[PDB]
Write a protein that binds this ligand. Structure first.
Ligand SMILES: CCCCCCCCCCCCCCCCCC(=O)OC[C@H](COP(=O)([O-])OCC(O)COP(=O)([O-])OC[C@@H](COC(=O)CCCCCCCCCCCCCCCCC)OC(=O)CCCCCCCCCCCCCCCCC)OC(=O)CCCCCCCCCCCCCCCCC
Ligand SMILES: CCCCCCCCCCCCCCCCCC(=O)OC[C@H](COP(=O)([O-])OCC[N+](C)(C)C)OC(=O)CCCCCCCCCCCCCCCCC
Ligand SMILES: CCCCCCCCCCCCO[C@@H]1O[C@H](CO)[C@@H](O[C@H]2O[C@H](CO)[C@@H](O)[C@H](O)[C@H]2O)[C@H](O)[C@H]1O
Lengths: 12, 74, 65, 22, 157, 143, 66, 71, 97, 52, 71, 71, 71, 71, 71, 71, 71, 71, 71
């Protein structure tokens, strides 16, 4: 919902 | 569940004027059937007029909520 | 009561001090309305080219116009 | 029926409780 | 917005000269950076001094003021005119009255609604405001405007 | 100096007090009346109308009454070296109560109500109501 | 997929960045005769069309009833 | 056996909320008059309206208590 | 001429052939145009444009009151790069090189 | 030959609604007419000025 | 003189809350009038709109009480 | 019949609610007097009016308590 | 068929609990109109949204009253 | 019997309610005195009158808690 | 299992505190929109967060209620 | 003595209500002292007076608890 | 077997009270944001901590309710 | 151990009420500290005195709870 | 049979009351911070101290509930 500088696993 | 919530709200706003016109009407009808004298009738006329104004208020409220619930962007 | 009516606190204070000055005793009331007469001459401009000029001798018409 | 007249005056009327008498 | 206070009679030495000098300095300093300047004045002398040079910047002028003593022509009127014509920054040029043979020309940078809204006013948190700050600020600011003009013009007189 | 209350009660046309040492001072805030003494907190308040009541240290029991129309009050804590705590009561029109009248007061009230009976403008209605307030306060405060 | 049967449109954000988006005309005018009416100024309707339109100055309560 | 008395006393208990409402209303009236003493008739009028509503509800609950007692 | 407020409306429109076409355009070819004297005017045009943009934003945007943003597990390009700024940079430097 | 004018419906709806409409119309007879005729008056004024 | 009376009495506990709500409503109207009298007809209007809910709810409760007194 | 004690005591709760309302109204009068100590009379008037209504309600609650007690 | 009636009467308490809350909402509307009459709309919308929520809660409790009353 | 003690307990609840009202009323005295000490003993007299009325109500509650205990 | 229906009623009484909370929230929202209107975008957001909690709690108070009405 | 135990517990409930009422006094005292410390002792006096009343009520109800727990 | 059910219903009521407290916190936060917008982040964090504690209490109540439904 | 447990639970309810009352006092402490830090310790003092009553009552409550748990 | 469960539920209600009390604490916190951030850390410390006391009381209540559950 909020932009972040970290990318999760599923969204890799 | 949202559909059930919405239909409940919609039906309540649709029947609100029917209630104000019917069940409070039945109450007034009871009072009319029971009362005989003139003083009480003089005082009860104003209650009837209040019910008129109250019905129009409920109708306004229902109009507002129905134009809110039947407004679509597209 | 004034930010709703579109009125300033200075305008309200002046227009109320006027009434208070009207509720004074005559010897001091004379000196009060003396020391609190009004005389101004507003002159409105727009890149030169005067739009209007107007005199004022009353507080209410001065604040109104 | 048509509203005849050359007049631009927007005219409305108020009524009384008395009838016209000739 | 530059509010220049001056007189309406002559033979006043060179006080209005110094006032108009400071005003010219301020205008020429603030028009370089690109700030659009407006000019309010009090007295015909400033008008005659700045017409030919800065008459394309006049906004509103008052005169015939000090026929009587000062608060005859209440500062509240001029302050209301300023607030109605609310600028983003306001300067006030006048003459301070040091002693009977000595004065001094000054410029007062004055706070405006834009400069108040752009600050949270944490410096006044030490003070208790009996009505809330947000409701009493707008009524306090007009009083501040009026009082500022009042003392400045007394000193100039 | 001393552990007193340094009042200055001032209008534009006359400064009634400058550094007067007092004990307690009552003032009619916009919400309601309240009384400032030494040790009172730093505060700001808007005033509405009524009778300031000053009480000197030399007096104690004796008082001085002054009617105020509108203005502000500023109570400032005492400097460490002064030993004394200061207060500033600013009023746009500060009269004494000796100089007030109830007849011209009621006449002005009547004329205000007459002017405001034609209630059309918001500022006119507001001015009528506020004049009613202030004139009622004048009537209740005059002797 | 090949791309022959792709979506026959482009998203509104990309059109807005291209400077291409048009928002208007919930309705349309199919025929040029109908499009150029307000620009002709002298024959918005042909004569035949005028006399055909003169037959519908009022609604037909008779036809409604029937 | 005395269930009608129980029902009446349980129906009566809305007098607490009615009185709370009346107290809040007249408190608002008194405060608004202490603030604006030149405006008392309009405030009293609205207070009378509210008191009429609240006393109507109170007399309703008392009447229903009497009904349940002497049905 | 007679006074135009005395004149019958349908008779005036029968006389006038131009404003006939103006009415057909907005009230026969559409059913949702406002009943104002000038629907083609700039105020109406700009209001329609702003309404268009607000409607589309409310429908499509990621918000606290989301209409269409729902059941999201595989995101599209725009939302993916708007949420993951680290990947927009990496995917972009690679593209340019 | 009926009970229509002696009805609960009459006394509850017909007389109250009708009497209230009558009283409101009598009390706001002119306010209503003015609020309605405002637009027509303005339009007629505009037309006459344009013509002139 | 049984459980119906008890239920119709327990139904009446809501009238207290309804009265508190009405009191809050009209106290707010009083305060707003004392603050800015020049919008009386508006505040009164909104108050009546609120009553159009609150009254209705209370009346519902009263009716349901009678429905449980003669179910 | 000791059962009617229960009912009477239950009726007494309204006295608690009335007391809360009375306290709120008196508190409002006390603050109003502090805010505008010039009048101190037109506020006490409305105070007594409200205490009239609240005392009336308390009295009828007490009376109904005694009624349900003895009967 | 007595426990159903008692259950419904006990479920009717949230109506009174909701009337409080509607009262506060419309009181806030009144006070906001008194503090800023320049904004009449944009306050009534939020008022109607919150009132809609509380109306939904009222519908819930009345529906469940009728449910337990017949099931 | 012992059931009377439950009546006494309900009476105690009424006492708790009056206690709540009494405390609320006192708070206003404290605040009005801190704001305007000059009129102290007036606020005290007004509070005394309110306190006496509340005290009488509490005394009555206690009396009933005794009367529906011994009877 | 009538006690099921009673438990359910009790489990629905909680709506009286829920709606109260919601009311207070929206009241504060309206006050904020009447005090600092230019930041509605903040206030509404915070309000929605609060509703996202309160809604959830109310849904639980329904769900478990129905569970105790069936199981 | 189970009834006695229940009556004593209810008395405890009354004590809790009294404590709730007591909180108001010290809140008002703290606010008035934050405003004007120079009226400390007077405020303390009034506070202790009211606390005396509250304490009296508490002691009374506790005593009644003991009575209804033994006699 | 519904005696456990009543306990669960009571737990739900407690949860509702917690919800009311949460709403009060949200209302205070909104008012604070309106008064001091620039300090939202700190106020929001404090509210979050309070919300977490309240949520923990609510979960604890729901858990105990579930336990009381079976054990 | 039924009656005893119920009595203890009621006492617990009283303790919860005491906690509610305490909250008001500490909120007043926070506000007073916000407005006048220079007498922070003199407020803290008064708050401790408030505890010296409130908590003490709570202690009494819990002690009586244990007594009626082993009476 | 399930009296202990009923007692536990009552204790849970008390816990809910404690949560409601906490809400006022953190409301005052989020308000005094808005009114003076420079002393916010001190205000936070006071709020934490109050919160700890409230939590301690709640924990005590929970312990009592467990003891009641286990007789
Ligand atoms: C019980 C109902 C059963 C059906 C269900 C209802 C569904 C429809 C609902 C409609 C509701 C609308 C509301 C009423 C409209 C009122 C206003 C209006 O109509 O304006 C006048 C208008 C007159 O038109 P005009 O603008 O004056 O034009 C006159 C021209 O000069 C004429 O010249 P021309 O050049 O135009 O042509 C001449 C001629 C013939 O045309 C020609 O030019 C020659 C070609 C004709 C040959 C073909 C004939 C058409 C097809 C066959 C029809 C019949 C049998 C079919 C058999 C099947 C095959 C064997 O014109 C016509 O025949 C007119 C066609 C009539 C069709 C109706 C109008 C379209 C309305 C849309 C309705 C939606 C239905 C969906 C469509 C189906 C799905 C796609 O009235 C109509 O013509 C329509 C009649 C309305 C139908 C009656 C329904 C009752 C309404 C009840 C309202 C009251 C409510 C409360 C009741 C309680 C009372 C106490
Ligand atoms: C987005 C859509 C929004 C929709 C909103 C819908 C809400 C409004 C729904 C209300 C409908 C109620 C009207 C029907 C009830 C009356 C029946 C009737 O007419 O009796 C025969 C009436 C009464 O006649 P009578 O009483 O003299 O004798 C005969 C009566 N009968 C036959 C019943 C025995 O016939 C008339 O003569 C009527 C003439 C007067 C006009 C009456 C209309 C005014 C009263 C109703 C207005 C309601 C609309 C309010 C709108 C407010 C909106 C801002
Ligand atoms: C679709 C529902 C919403 C719209 C409402 C439709 C109209 C509402 C009907 C009128 C409401 C009151 O109706 C009134 O109560 C009931 C209705 O059966 C009747 O009461 C009668 O039947 C009930 C049966 O339950 C008996 O217990 C009662 O002793 C008997 O007098 C009254 O004779 C009627 O005057």
């Amino acid at each position: 919902a909020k932009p972040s500088w970290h990318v999760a696993r599923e969204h890799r | 569940r949202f559909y059930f919530m919405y239909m409940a709200r919609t039906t309540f706003q649709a029947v609100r004027p029917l209630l104000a016109f019917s069940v409070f009407g039945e109450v007034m009808k009871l009072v009319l059937a029971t009362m005989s004298s003139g003083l009480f009738s003089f005082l009860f006329s104003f209650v009837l007029a209040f019910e008129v104004f109250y019905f129009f208020l409920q109708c306004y409220i229902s109009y507002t909520f129905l134009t809110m619930f039947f407004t679509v962007l597209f | 009561m004034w930010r709703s009516s579109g009125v300033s606190f200075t305008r309200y204070a002046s227009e109320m001090a006027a009434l208070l000055r009207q509720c004074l005793k005559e010897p001091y009331r004379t000196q009060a309305m003396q020391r609190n007469q009004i005389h101004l001459k507003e002159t409105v401009y727009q890149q030169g080219q005067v739009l209007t000029r107007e005199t004022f001798n009353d507080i209410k018409k001065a604040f109104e116009a | 029926y048509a509203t005849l007249g050359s007049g631009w005056s927007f005219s409305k009327v108020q009524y009384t409780k008395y009838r016209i008498t000739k | 917005a530059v509010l220049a206070l001056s007189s309406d009679k002559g033979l006043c030495g060179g006080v209005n000269s110094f006032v108009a000098k400071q005003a010219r300095i301020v205008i020429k300093e603030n028009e370089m950076a690109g700030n659009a300047v407006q000019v309010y004045g009090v007295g015909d002398k400033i008008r005659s001094a700045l017409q030919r040079t800065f008459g394309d910047r006049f906004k509103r002028i008052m005169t015939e003021v000090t026929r009587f003593p000062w608060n005859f022509g209440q500062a509240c009127i001029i302050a209301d005119r300023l607030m109605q014509d609310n600028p983003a920054r306001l300067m006030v040029i006048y003459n301070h009255f040091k002693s009977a043979v000595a004065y001094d020309t000054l410029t007062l940078n004055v706070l405006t609604p834009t400069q108040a809204a752009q600050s949270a006013k944490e410096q006044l948190n030490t003070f208790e405001f009996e009505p809330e700050k947000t409701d009493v600020w707008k009524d306090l600011q007009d009083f501040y405007y009026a009082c500022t003009v009042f003392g400045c013009m007394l000193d100039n007189i | 100096f001393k552990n007193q209350l340094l009042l200055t009660l001032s209008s534009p046309s006359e400064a009634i007090y400058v550094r007067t040492p007092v004990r307690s001072v009552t003032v009619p805030g916009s919400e309601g009346a309240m009384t400032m003494t030494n040790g009172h907190s730093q505060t700001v308040a808007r005033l509405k109308a009524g009778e300031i009541i000053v009480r000197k240290g030399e007096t104690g029991d004796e008082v001085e009454r002054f009617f105020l129309s509108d203005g502000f009050v500023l109570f400032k804590s005492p400097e460490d070296d002064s030993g004394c705590c200061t207060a500033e009561v600013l009023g746009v029109e500060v009269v004494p109560v000796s100089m007030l009248d109830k007849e011209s007061a009621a006449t002005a009230l009547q004329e205000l109500l007459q002017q405001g009976a034609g209630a059309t403008d918001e500022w006119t209605k507001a001015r009528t109501l506020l004049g009613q307030e202030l004139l009622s306060s004048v009537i209740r405060a005059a002797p | 997929p090949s791309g022959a049967y792709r979506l026959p449109a482009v998203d509104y954000k990309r059109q807005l960045s291209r400077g291409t988006l048009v928002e208007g005309a919930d309705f349309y005018l199919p025929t040029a005769q109908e499009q150029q009416r307000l620009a002709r100024h002298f024959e918005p309707y042909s004569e035949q069309e005028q006399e055909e339109r003169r037959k519908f100055r009022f609604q037909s309560i008779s036809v409604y009833l029937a | 056996a005395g269930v009608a008395s129980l029902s009446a006393a349980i129906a009566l208990m809305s007098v607490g909320g009615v009185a709370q409402g009346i107290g809040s209303l007249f408190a608002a009236l008194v405060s608004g008059t202490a603030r604006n003493p030149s405006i008392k008739e309009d405030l009293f009028t609205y207070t009378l309206i509210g008191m009429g509503f609240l006393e109507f509800l109170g007399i309703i609950c008392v009447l229903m208590s009497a009904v349940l007692l002497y049905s | 001429n007679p006074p135009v407020w005395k004149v019958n409306t349908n008779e005036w429109l029968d006389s006038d052939q131009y404003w006939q076409a103006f009415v057909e355009k907005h009230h026969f070819y559409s059913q949702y145009q406002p009943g104002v004297v000038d629907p083609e005017a700039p105020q109406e045009v700009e209001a329609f444009k702003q309404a268009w943009h607000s409607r589309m934003g409310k429908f499509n945007d990621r918000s606290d009151t989301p209409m269409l943003y729902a059941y999201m597990n595989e995101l599209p390009s725009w939302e993916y790069y708007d949420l993951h700024r680290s990947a927009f940079l990496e995917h972009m430097t690679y593209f340019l090189v | 030959s009926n009970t229509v004018l002696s009805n609960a419906w009459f006394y509850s709806k017909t007389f109250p609604f009708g009497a209230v409409f009558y009283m409101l119309g009598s009390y706001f007879y002119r306010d209503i007419r003015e609020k309605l005729w405002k637009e027509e008056k303005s339009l007629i004024h505009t037309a006459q000025e344009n013509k002139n």
